[PDB]
Amino acid sequence: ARNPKCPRIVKSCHSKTLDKYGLIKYPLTSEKAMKKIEEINTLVFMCDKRANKKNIKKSVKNLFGIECDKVNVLNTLNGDKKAYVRLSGEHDALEVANKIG
RNA sequence: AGCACAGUCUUAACGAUGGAUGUCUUGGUUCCUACAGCGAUGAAGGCCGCAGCAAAAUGCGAUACGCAAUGAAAAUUGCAGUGACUGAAUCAUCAGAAUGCUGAAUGUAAACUACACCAAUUCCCUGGGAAUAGUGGUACUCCUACAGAAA
Known part of the structure; x- marks a missing residue:
């Protein structure tokens, strides 16, 4: 070598x-996203175009302290990634609601 | 409040219509003078981004319409922020930075953000402690040197 x-x-x-x-x-604040957060504890986040889904899961847990049951992602026509993150069931949307507003 | 044939033609006045003329002009133009190559230390070309409010040129590259440094040097305002009794706000200079994805483009590729393999790798602290699958290397030809193989 x-x-x-x-x-x-x-x-x-x-x-x-x-x-x-x-x-x-940043978290996405759309009416659709608000309904998802409210009813099924599913958070919608805008993320980088080149971002890795596992790393998005790591990043949510790092930045917000909260664990993800599943992370579903999309490449948008808004030039970025839109990540639908379903939270693990022992942590709650209300805590996230306090952090986002 | 009466009076006017209408149309067509022609004329004058006063306008619409149109963008000529004139007047300009941070542009062209030619000549002359002068220097004059960039690139695997990854160019040009091309994409993809980047403004607090930001679309297109310009500018810039995930530190992104400025950074550091210098010389000027107190303002900056469309809104909104900011700064001044001199390394801030404004300019110019710009020698230190940075330097996206590509593209000769060079790991195999290509209407692919596809796919290998080898190195695992980075930071902090003064001989130790933390992080991250991330980051590199691996084209073809050549040359000089070295190696163990052969005849």
């Missing part, structure tokens, strides 16, 4: 591969 004198590229800079804060952009 290789044993170079020096690697060709060295990245000095801070990481920017895709920040978790920015991977998930």
